[PDB]
Design a protein around this nucleic acid. Structure first.
Ligand SMILES: [Zn+2]
Ligand SMILES: [Zn+2]
Ligand SMILES: [Zn+2]
Lengths: 87, 81, 238, 99, 50, 61
RNA sequence: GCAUGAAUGGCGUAACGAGGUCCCCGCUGUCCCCGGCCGGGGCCCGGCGAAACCUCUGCCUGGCGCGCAUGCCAGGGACC
RNA sequence: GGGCCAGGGUUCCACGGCAAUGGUCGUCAGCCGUGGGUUAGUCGGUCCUAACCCCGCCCGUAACUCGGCGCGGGGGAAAGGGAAACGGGUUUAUAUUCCCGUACCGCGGGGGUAGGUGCGGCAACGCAAGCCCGGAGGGUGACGCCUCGGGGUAGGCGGACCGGCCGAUGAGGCCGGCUAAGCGUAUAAGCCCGGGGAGUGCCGUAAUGGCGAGAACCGGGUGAAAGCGCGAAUGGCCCCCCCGUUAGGGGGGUUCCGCCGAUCCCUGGGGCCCGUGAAAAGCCCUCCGGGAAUUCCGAUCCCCCGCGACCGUACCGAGAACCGACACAGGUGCCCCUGGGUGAGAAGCCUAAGGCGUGUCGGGGGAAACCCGGCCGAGGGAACUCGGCAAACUGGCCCCGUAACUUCGGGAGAAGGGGUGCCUGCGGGUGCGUAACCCGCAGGUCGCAGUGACUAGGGGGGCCCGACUGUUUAAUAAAAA
RNA sequence: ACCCGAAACCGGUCGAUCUAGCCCGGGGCAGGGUGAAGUCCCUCAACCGAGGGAUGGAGGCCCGCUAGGGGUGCUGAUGUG
């Protein structure tokens, strides 16, 4: 294979073609999952995917419908309670 | 786990000398125990890096000694303050 | 003859230049204008390991939006609040002028001149002790055992530097030393001048002995200051 | 034309496999690897311990043993007292712990 | 090489065009005095200046 | 070593390539200057009196 | 102790070594004492076909001689 | 053997040739003559930045094309980051580029719609969920080494059935039984959301472990690789029949169960650091400010139309296409990948696929002596030699057994002893299994020899030196240096 | 200064594709053995103790014609290769 594909940043799959010839398909690895800003726990409702997959989706299909979608539920509730008490 | 003297220094086999192996084993045995956390007060503190310790229950992380969470100088300054 | 290691180090070649891009950055105090006459609150966000520092470092975010990197004192807690200024309470992690620090206190990261950012007591596990306070100078005992006078307006942090006792354990392996010194690009392994050729070292020669006393004058020229430089004495003190 | 492949045959290998299944070609003189290389250690422990845990859970579900008995047998299995479910059942019958 | 720059490719093309024999009509016109030129080249023996 | 086997490692990037200014294959590519005419290092041509190379060009030696 | 010696370290030392050295079991063609066999050269035949080197030459015994001569002196041999 | 960088630069393809080249000949050729051949919105460069480098100001220098800190600008990776395409066919030579079929991304445009002015859940969350300009924050890009569990996929094996070839037109063996991107679709681990209120404690893993700072347990949310449906049989593959003077035309099939299973993918555990294992571009979300919208404005949602520039693209890729003067036994590139048997094994041996007979001079022969590379040698067994140099002994696996010394780790596979083939039947472990892998037992039997070939340690006791792993005179010194 | 021959000395320039060192970004190391810390369990007694069995995978550890790297002996062959 080419030196560019010799890199391990590509995942390689062996497939057999409908014409009966075996081919090597290379794909780019998917990113990790989003993590909470404060405690670093994984978030929910945010699909993984490379930029093209992320752009393939609508706005409401890539984040939860609640305030502060960048924090996990404990952190979201805690921040709002603190803000209300301070106010 | 059933070794009379080598302790954690048993990975070296018959190398590096008695005094070196003893001092390694003593330091590592003291470091690898479970230490009381200063926040939740439970023996669930482990070293994550040189001079950085973290509690495995409440998650509080602090800076301490290279091989022990607290040193004599730290204790002295804490009592003085 | 040929050059010495010390002579070659002065030309700043990559063999001797420090790799100041693996590190997290210098740890200097915020500008004196903020700290003088005002006291600022800050929150500790993270504590991490600096490749070449000998001490852990910490990230602090202050109430005015300024982010800074500091040497973490022993016992510092992530998420805690620290104060910098003349009115800061006497507690570990607080920075304030030496005039406001009571005697008998342990301090670190002392400023040589007001606003210079800190030069003294920065290694891991080190501290200095405040001895006496006067209207024109504050006496501090340094880790080396010297009593140095600082301007009263010089700033210092309360506590001891984290990472002490690092020398208790052996470096068991040549490979352990290899990694330790490669982290900062220090010349390792080192040769012995007595085993070089006469062209390379003053002590070089076929015989592996120095042909001259190893105490060299303080007035010797470059390329000759080897061995014990301007030594007051040598040997074991009884 | 395109000549057909000279396909290799596996008839003798099939016969040898049947004989080995019966128990032939397996003596000391036909062994080259170490006994552990032939029957790995961690894999064997995994098989046996998972089997023991499954059997204990099945017994508890069927109500043949109580919670205390299940707990005691669980710690015993972790400790490695039982090398197989046959020995586990022998222990059960011997101590009369099976209802 | 698989990947080439255009300028180098053009220079190689000029050398390739240069590498050819003298025309027979040139030989007969010159009366056999001109039979070769100094730019003749064999790929495996004489290598390009670049 | 140091002989025949050493010359087999000449398959890396060439040290010198063609120079846009003087047209000679002397352009140090890694450093970025010409070892013949000084292109990329100076505005004026690299000419030295101990060198007869620039006289050979115009048969003026 | 011609002329060792304590950090140009002294003494000892488990483990380690394509380091140096002595001995023992076993083994053997190292040896007594060398003999068979196999493949490739060597040899012959058909092709392609150089190089190092070269004052001209080119038998010996006793000699003279810049003291150790194919070439000189006296003898002896020598068909190509 | 297959794919392909760097380097080479026409060596690639067809026709016509053999004066020269080719270690011989040659009708052949990487050779000589003639004519041809490299088609991109998707693959690379182009974009970002890393180590680092350059110009301008500034300082120094007699001066500079010279040395240099700071500020401003720029460059810097064809194996780092980084929008989008895969099947079939076609040519003597190009194809992810050409033709047919089916897709995707960027920009602009047109008609609708969601929304501006909307909902379901206690919640995690499910949703098409307004437009434009500027800014801030979060996530992602974005990351070390060692070790293990779980879920898949390539490939492989055994059985049934259909077609064909060999075989006695017996048993039986082998060959084919295929399936891309794209589009729609779900769970696993992890994490989360509600109920629940434990301790003479229960719960769980391969292991470490978790619990009043909330366990057992009952419901759920989000979440990969994969599989599944369309793509898709009209395509590819095997076979059969009629026309057969060239030249052609039709009919069948291409279906299932059970295992092993990756170094190839996805996902979680755990451990180590006096060692901490990149940056920016880009992309997604949220939040703030500003600007238009009501017989109006208007999409991240469906349908459709138009446009997508420049350069590389042939070929070898090496025991003949590169470097070494060579069609050099070296080096670069073994840089990436690998059916069956035996077997622990990517070992040795045999063999399928693919390749080759060009590691390119042939013929003769008891056709010698002698030299290099191998096999055996009676009796003795180092008497040889500076010196057991060379060769020889041992050799895999199971069981028993194992010394001085010691830094207690080791020495150690010490030493030494016994067994090993094939055949006929049982027992055992995990397993649904008479699937697959592994572990014992009894009996019969042959040879000089059962790790029968291949693979495959000889051992012990004193002394000197250096603690050990490691490095050294590339080309006479590997050592106590 | 009849002609030829030196080892060497000085000036400015060219070289890290070989090789030495360091920095940035990347590829590779079949199979097996031994078994460190950590974590445990079982049986009899209990005034003390005694006797067994696991699990876990560290090492500049071990055997190894895996790949890759090195170059001790034959002072083997070749030594106008
Ligand atoms: Zn959170
Ligand atoms: Zn805690
Ligand atoms: Zn130039």
């Amino acid at each position: 294979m080419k030196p560019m594909y010799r890199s391990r940043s590509w995942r390689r799959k062996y497939v057999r073609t409908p014409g009966g010839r075996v081919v090597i398909h290379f794909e780019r690895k998917k990113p990790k999952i989003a993590h909470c800003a404060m405690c670093g726990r994984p978030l929910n409702g945010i699909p993984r995917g490379r930029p093209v997959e992320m752009r393939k989706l609508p706005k409401t299909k890539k984040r939860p419908e609640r305030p502060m979608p960048h924090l996990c539920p404990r952190c979201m509730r805690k921040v709002m309670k603190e803000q209300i008490r301070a106010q | 786990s059933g070794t009379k003297k080598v302790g954690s220094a048993g990975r070296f086999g018959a190398r590096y000398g008695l005094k070196i192996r003893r001092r390694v084993a003593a330091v590592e045995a003291k470091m690898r125990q479970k230490h009381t956390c200063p926040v939740c007060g439970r023996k669930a503190v482990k070293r994550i890096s040189t001079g950085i310790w973290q509690c495995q229950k409440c998650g509080a992380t602090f800076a301490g000694g290279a091989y022990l969470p607290v040193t004599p100088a730290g204790k002295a300054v804490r009592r003085i303050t | 003859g040929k050059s010495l290691i010390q002579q070659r180090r002065g030309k700043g070649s990559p063999t001797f230049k420090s790799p100041s891009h693996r590190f997290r950055g210098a740890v200097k105090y915020i500008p004196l204008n903020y700290t003088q006459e005002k006291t600022l609150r800050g929150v500790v966000e993270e504590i991490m390991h600096d490749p070449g520092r000998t001490a852990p470092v910490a990230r602090v975010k202050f109430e005015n939006g300024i982010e800074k990197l500091i040497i973490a004192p022993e016992g510092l807690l992530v998420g805690q609040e620290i104060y910098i200024g003349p009115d800061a309470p006497i507690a570990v992690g607080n920075t304030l002028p030496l005039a406001k620090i009571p005697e008998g206190t342990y301090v670190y990261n002392i400023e040589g001149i007001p606003g210079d950012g800190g030069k003294y007591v920065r290694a891991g596990g080190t501290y200095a002790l405040v001895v006496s306070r006067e209207p024109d100078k504050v006496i501090v005992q340094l880790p080396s055992g010297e009593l140095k006078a600082f301007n009263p307006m010089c700033r210092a942090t309360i506590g001891v530097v984290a990472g002490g006792g690092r020398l208790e354990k052996p470096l068991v392996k040549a490979g352990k030393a290899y990694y330790k010194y490669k982290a900062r690009n220090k010349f390792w392994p080192t040769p012995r001048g007595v085993k070089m050729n006469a062209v390379n070292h003053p002590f070089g020669g076929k015989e592996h002995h120095p042909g001259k006393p190893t105490t060299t004058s303080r007035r010797a020229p470059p390329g000759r200051k080897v061995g014990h430089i301007a030594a007051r004495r040598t040997g074991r003190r009884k | 034309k395109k000549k057909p492949i000279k396909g290799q045959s596996r008839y003798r290998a099939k016969i040898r496999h049947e004989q080995k299944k019966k128990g032939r070609h397996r003596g000391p003189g036909s062994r080259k690897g170490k006994k552990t290389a032939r029957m790995g250690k961690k894999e064997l422990w995994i098989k046996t311990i998972r089997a023991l845990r499954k059997e204990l859970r099945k017994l508890k579900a069927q109500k043949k043993i109580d919670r205390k008995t299940y707990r005691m047998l669980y710690i015993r299995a972790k400790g490695g007292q039982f090398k197989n479910k046959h020995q586990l059942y022998l222990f059960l019958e011997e101590h009369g712990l099976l209802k | 090489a698989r990947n080439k720059p255009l300028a180098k490719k053009l220079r190689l093309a000029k050398a390739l065009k240069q590498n050819r024999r003298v025309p027979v009509w040139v030989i007969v016109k010159t009366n056999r005095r001109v039979l070769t030129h100094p730019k003749r080249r064999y790929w495996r023996r004489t290598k390009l200046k670049e | 070593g140091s002989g025949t086997a050493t010359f087999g490692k000449r398959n890396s990037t060439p040290t010198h390539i063609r120079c846009r200014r003087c047209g000679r294959v002397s352009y140090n590519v890694k450093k970025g200057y010409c070892a013949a005419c000084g292109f990329g290092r100076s505005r004026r041509l690299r000419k030295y009196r101990w060198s007869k190379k620039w006289k050979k060009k115009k048969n003026a030696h």
